[PDB]
Symmetry: none
Subunit: 142 residues, 2 copies
Amino acid sequence: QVASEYLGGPGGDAFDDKAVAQNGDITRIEMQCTDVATYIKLRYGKVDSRQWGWGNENCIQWSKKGEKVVHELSSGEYITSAIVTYGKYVQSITFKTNKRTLPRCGTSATEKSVTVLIPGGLKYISGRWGCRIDGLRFHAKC
Amino acid sequence: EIASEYLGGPGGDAFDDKAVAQNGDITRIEMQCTDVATYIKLRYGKVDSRQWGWGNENCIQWSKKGEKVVHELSSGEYITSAIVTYGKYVQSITFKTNKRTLPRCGTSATEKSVTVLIPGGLKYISGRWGCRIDGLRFHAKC
Ligand SMILES: OC[C@H]1O[C@H](O[C@H]2O[C@H](CO)[C@@H](O)[C@H](O)[C@H]2O)[C@H](O)[C@@H](O)[C@@H]1O
């Protein structure tokens, strides 16, 4: 389907949730949040994707870790907007749904900002990951 | 139907291309481009909408007019996103298709920017118009 540009840097390893997303619409958002967002993990239908970020606990060598933030989406709720601050890594992620606006993951919002609107709801994410979220791309439903 | 939020201000007159878009998929983008985008007029199949913007030549007493820009879409080419900078009016529009990123209409990109994904390709637009493009909504195919 249609996707956004890649937002982020060249580090890490590529991931793409296209296949796991075929299990269903996003039902849950999980992130690890401190002054930056350190991982993202979505659930597609009943099927969690991988933890994309915070590859192992020794990543504390290079960044704060943060706390786990879970937002369960209700039936018929979908993400219509992503505000992402980023440079060589994703710094922060603020999601809005057709039902409500979620708190930003990442308290610092100092990097360049981009707002991506997804009519009909975000289908899935791809990007690059390691100790952090090197980059994100947003994929619509067709 | 899947459609983006309305991007713009409350001035002008509402337009909606729903009916004229029954004439077919979008085959051409026509705009008027200066420091800002001053009208848009898409072609559906062989049939154009009315000109949405630059209502009359006295509009030069409020803003610059600009030059006609035409992008012909190849068959099977469809519009997949738009970067829109906007405030009281639409300032600039940068259309992207499944085949290429097109030139910006509107050299100034200084107001609020958003990247609208248009899942499945752009079906038609609606919005508000007058001397300028007061605002736009993008209607997606799926
Ligand atoms: O622990 C190994 C390395 O961890 C960091 O680098 C990784 O994580 C980054 C953010 O996800 C990626 O950009 C990078 O490509 C990964 O290797 C850290 O920056 C390095 O110093 C460590 O060697």
